Each structure stands twice: as structure tokens, then as C-alpha cells.
Design a protein around this ligand. Sequence first.
Ligand SMILES: [Zn+2]
Ligand SMILES: [Zn+2]
Lengths: 339, 339
Amino acid sequence: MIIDCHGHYTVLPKAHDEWREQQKAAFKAGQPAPPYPEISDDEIRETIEANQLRLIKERGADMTIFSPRASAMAPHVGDQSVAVPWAQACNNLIARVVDLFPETFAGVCMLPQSPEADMTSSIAELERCVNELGFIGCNLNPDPGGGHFKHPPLTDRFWYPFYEKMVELDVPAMIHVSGSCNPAMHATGAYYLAADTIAFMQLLQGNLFADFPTLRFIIPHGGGAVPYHWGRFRGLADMLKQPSLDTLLMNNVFFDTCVYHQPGINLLADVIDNKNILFGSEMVGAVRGIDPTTGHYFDDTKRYIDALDISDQERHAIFEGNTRRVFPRLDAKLKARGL
Amino acid sequence: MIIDCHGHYTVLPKAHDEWREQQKAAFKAGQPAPPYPEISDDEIRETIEANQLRLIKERGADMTIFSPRASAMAPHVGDQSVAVPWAQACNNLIARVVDLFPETFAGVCMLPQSPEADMTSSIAELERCVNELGFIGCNLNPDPGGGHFKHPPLTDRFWYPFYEKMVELDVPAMIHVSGSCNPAMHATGAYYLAADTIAFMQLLQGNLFADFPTLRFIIPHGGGAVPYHWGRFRGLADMLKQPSLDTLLMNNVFFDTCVYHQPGINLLADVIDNKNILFGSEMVGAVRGIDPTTGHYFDDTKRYIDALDISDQERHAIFEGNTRRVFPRLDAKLKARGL
Ligand SMILES: [Zn+2]
Ligand SMILES: [Zn+2]
């Protein structure tokens, strides 16, 4: 089995983006937001079937772990009064897609984070999503201010009440920022990668997993700059007098394979331990075109693992095993289906 | 010839970092600057001979392109009254080093940048360092605020008068942030690399080198995250409806070889055209220790170049050929010595 660990609901029913701009325009006008529209299951079936389900079929995947659209999380302007109904509405959409397609999609939640609030409503939405909607994970935005890193590092006690709910519920988080309000910083091509790189160093500077020994993070997009500069990060453990990386982090930190070329993927498999590598592609996302240089899709990352010269034990772990051990609720669901 | 294009004067005379802390502490009230100390040729020569030159010898290099200490250039709080005398004092030390060891060190200057100012004083110090001190390039800081990316992208018209001076003096710039004022961002493990990645995407969003076709940038640390995610950046060129990377950027953008492990060095060599790779090591810098996994130093990047399977012309471009074309003034100085 091939479980795609990274994916967002990007091609949406039209009334959803419509309401989102009315909710945005009503808040900056001092008005309440209009009622959320009704969306048909056939409309939801249409968006999914035309896009995600088609490519999963073509590309030989079985499941995709599905979360709200990453750019549209935009936890900026304005406040919690926008963030909570928006986060709730997007995850309700994710829950409905799983209802219509439960053998293929597993849910991961966005959180109603915003710069002016602590993690109280996100702990609520995580609980609502895991307990009532059957979700298996969350998306954690390390900079809900969106491009100036004006929020505390992930080792800060600001985050500690949130991590306790994660560990009790046994759910991991993918560190994942959203849209950028910084003109100097494009989101999907720079801001995503910088936050990944910064997040990994933040953990390297501290000892979070001394406090939460079972807490597990995924840093997406092959870990930002990190495997490419792996030797730089090992040497900094020594420069900081910190424990070696294999013990400090790599039992709690895992990287996905949304690196969009064979040489980036060849390097990931070469430098990061097989158990820390999770298959992902983030299809219908940042890079939707074909590679002139290969004739295959950029985000068809299975082709890079499939082209690797690895053992079947290694193929099983990237494609299915690693994700099921980091997401226990998904392992438990697949056992209960005999898989 | 073996020229290390990236290197800082990191081990300083005691009074310099001392005077830096008094210039900071005097500004902590309303005071002018304390007396700048006198520094001897023998003290300076000692630090160089105990450090950089000894390692050049053992690592078998001929030249180092030398710039002020990068972490301590960081002009946080406050303004030009600090940034200009600090840069002048810093650049003088590099000038004196080259005076003492001129066949071995070539000078590149830091600039008097600060968040509230334009490039007027930066233009002056570059002219002063190039015209009067004979420098061959500069270090250009895209975020002097020290950790928040609150400054305009490198494509903005804010930067154009400075590029005009770079263009007239025939000096390139290495894109370089400094120390971090962000609690969420360690400098050498995140901020250095995060800025490199953000800098490259900014230029990919626009067409700066249509305006300044002779403008040349070096993005250090193997391009930050950039070669590792080259397919993501190529695929984003189509997503942005933009010209291809080889034509939009790769006649004007150069990457050094400060990637501190063989597989990262293997990837950079693999995806970046030979003409865009400049040998560097940033020795005695962020990572000063030995690699347990290899038995050689992390920052001994020449050893990684030596292990590549490339032609002698290809080795020639990395070690001597590419940098002599990007720093014409040094080509002319080396030509003027018959080499
Ligand atoms: Zn994503
Ligand atoms: Zn440097």
C-alpha cells in the first residue's frame, strides 16, 4: 500500500471560496459574515473526482492524507472571530470528503491559529476533529503572523498546553505555514521552505522531546534545506554542545518526499534514515505542470522512490509503514479493515 | 589556482569586539563612540597565521576572498550612526589583512546597512573600499532588521541605485544576512539558509537582470535550499508563467560550495551547471569541528570537490575559472601578476 502523507483540498466548490471572500469583506467592514452556503455531495464529489481521485488512480496510490488548502488557511487579517468559523468550515469539508470517499482519504485538520490568540481554540478544534470527525492529525502553523516569524519557537512553553492534547490523543503534527502577507517572501516557493528549515533548527537549539518523549513532528517538503545541508546540521550539534541528531530529533522528527526531482529525492534517501522518510507528493498544489525535462509530472514523486535502488523493506516503509507508525489512529483503522 | 570565494575575519583582536560592545553600550543612553583602539600588525598577523593561513596551507588553497565577520556585522539597533563607523572599522581590518598577506587574501566589504536607511551610505563605503582600498566585491544584506524580512525584495526599485554602482565599479555582491534578532530563528543554521532561499525566489518572481544584465549575485551555502529543490523551482517558473531559470537567472546568479557533506556537494555539482558553482568553504566559521563520520573537517569542502568525477576543465572552473569571471577586478590583479 502507498499512503500519500501530504495533501490539501485545493480545487474546491465555488461557493466555498465565494463565502470566504464575503467573510473576509464583512469582517473588514464591521459586519457579521453571511450564512455559509449549502454544498452538495455531488459538488464535493465533482471537485475530488476530477482532480485528486484521478491522479491517485493514474499514479498508483491507495490513500492520501488530506487537510484543508494550505494557502487559504491565511491566519492573518484578522482575528479569532474569522479563524475559528473558517477553520471549522474547512475541516467540515475535509470530513465530508472522507465521508464520500473513506477508503482513500484520511483527515488532517488545520487549526484556528491567529497572532493575537493562544492555542485554546486550536486545542478545541483538534479535539472536535479527532474525537468527533475521526481525524488522525493536525497542521501546526509555527508563524500564524505569516512571514516575519514574530511568534515563539516551537520549543517555547507557549506551545506546551497544545502539545499535551497531541500526546494524549496520540496525533502527530505537520509543521505547516500558510499564505504570506510579506511582498518579499513568496509562500509556496520560499516561505514554506524557510519555515521548515527554521523549525528544524529551533528543535536543534532545544530539548522539546525531553518534555514530550512521544511527540512526533513532520517537517514537509523533504525537510526544507535540512537533508541537503545535513552535514551542516550535524556539525552545529557539536558547535552548540547538543546531543547528536539521531537521538535528539530523528525519533520524533520525520521528513516527507515532496521534493520535485530525482536528484533531490536521491539525496533525501541517501542522507536521512529510511524510518524518517514518509511518502508525500502534495499533488494539485504548488507545482501542477509537467517536467519538460522528463515527460512526467513534477509532483509525481512516487516515480522518484520507484526509481530508487532500494530494498523492498525500504519501499514498504516509505510508502506505507513509516506513516502508519507516526499516525497511530490510521494504523488502528487499517488493522480494523484487515489491512 | 584554488581561490576560496567565501571567508570572514572571525578571530579578531580583543579590543575590536570589545569596542563593539562599548559602541553598543554607549548608544544605550545618548553617547558618542568610545576611543577606537590601536591594533598591531603582529597581533593581526598572528591570528591570521594561527588560523586562516595555517588551514589554507594544509587544505592546499592559494587564495581566500575575505569579508568582515558576518555575525557581528548585524546592525540591529540602531541606525546609521552605528552602521557607518562599524562598517568602516570592520573593512579597514580586512584591508590591513590584505596589506599584510596580499597574494593570499582579496577584500570584499560589508555595507553600512540599517533598517531605516536607503543605500546612500552603502554606495559610499563600496566606492571607498573598491576605489581607495582596492576591494573586489561587497556583501549585500537583504534584511538588516535582523530576523523578520521586513525589507523590500531584491527586485524592488529601492535597490536600483546600488546595483548601478555595483555595475559601474565592476564588483559583484554576495547575498548575506547577518546575526538574528528573532528568538524563533538561529542565525547560521536557519537565518543564513532561509534568506538564501527567499532571495532566489524573489528574483524568480521578477526580471531584474533584464534591467541590469551585467549584475551578478552570489547566493552562499550552496544556494541555501535551492539546488535541493531545483525541480520545485523549475516547476514554479511555469506556475509563475516566467522565463526558464537558465535564462531568467543563471547567467547572473552563482552558488558557492559551502555545503558541508559529500552528498550535498554531490547534488550541487549534479543539478547546477558547472559555470554557476564557485569554490568556497567558509572555514573557521559556523562549523569549526571535525566530521565523526568521515575523519576530516566539515568545512574542508575542497576534499569534496576532489572526490567528484568531473573533468579538469570542470574542476578548473570551480576552483579558479568561475570566480575570476565573477570578480573581474581580481582577474585583472591576477593577470597583472602573470598568472
Ligand atoms: Zn503543503
Ligand atoms: Zn558567510
